[PDB]
């Protein structure tokens, strides 16, 4: 799997691939690897499909109980730490999850938290997680600036997944785009690599390794 989220002037961009595999078998190319916890909170999934899906769904229940009890939307820090404290209780059990908690709140602003199943919790501006995290990093890091436009940021996030989708055998299917602002997350569509690759190759003039 390949997932990346990065922070810029316009807010937070979240791009994920849509493929799930069992060994070398491609199980599905149509998986939602982003969970919409609430209007201002997003969850990214890497590692065990069941582990990520179950526990990130469970988190959404805990985030709802927080705003019922405290009459206030949970902070990205608190939301991320509920999940990181949960997986830490299961440390050594063999949970395999690599997740990014992305959201906006008034007190924090746009925030990204990397949370994995060995209990690591990191705040940061750029994260790539999955088998093709390195392929995504390669394109993202070499093109990233803070002053990217919402249009350019969305494209770079999309292009970084495509890059990994290509080279990494275990990444592909389609690219799911999200843009997190002060007003909440906005969905920017599902992009099939089948069409996107040839569209990018032709328009960009890149992917010269491939027989055109």
């Amino acid at each position: 799997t390949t997932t990346l989220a990065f922070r810029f002037q316009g807010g937070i961009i979240v791009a994920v691939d849509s493929r799930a595999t069992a060994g070398n078998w491609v199980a599905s190319q149509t998986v939602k690897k982003v969970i919409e916890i609430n209007p201002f909170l997003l969850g990214t999934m890497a590692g065990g499909a069941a582990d990520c899906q179950f526990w990130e769904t469970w988190l959404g229940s805990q985030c709802r109980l927080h705003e019922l009890r405290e009459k206030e939307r949970i902070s990205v820090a608190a939301a991320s730490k509920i999940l990181s404290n949960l997986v830490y209780q299961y440390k050594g059990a063999g949970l395999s999850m690599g997740t990014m908690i992305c959201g906006y709140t008034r007190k924090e602003g746009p925030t990204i938290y990397y949370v994995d199943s060995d209990g690591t919790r990191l705040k940061g501006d750029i994260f790539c997680v999955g088998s093709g995290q390195t392929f995504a990093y390669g394109v993202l890091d070499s093109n990233y600036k803070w002053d990217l436009s919402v249009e350019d940021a969305l494209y770079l996030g999309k292009r970084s997944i495509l890059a990994a989708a290509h080279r990494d055998a275990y990444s592909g299917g389609s690219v799911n785009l999200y843009h997190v602002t002060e007003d909440g997350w906005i969905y920017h569509g599902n992009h099939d690599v089948g069409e996107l690759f040839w569209k990018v190759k032709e328009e960009e003039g890149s992917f010269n390794n491939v027989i055109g």
């Binding site: 799997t1 493929r19 799930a20 595999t21 069992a22 199980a27 998986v31 690897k33 999934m45 890497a46 590692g47 065990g48 499909a49 069941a50 990520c52 395999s96 999955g130």
Partner: peptide, 4 residues
């Protein structure tokens, strides 16, 4: 089981 699957992975992502």
């Amino acid at each position: 089981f699957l992975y992502x």
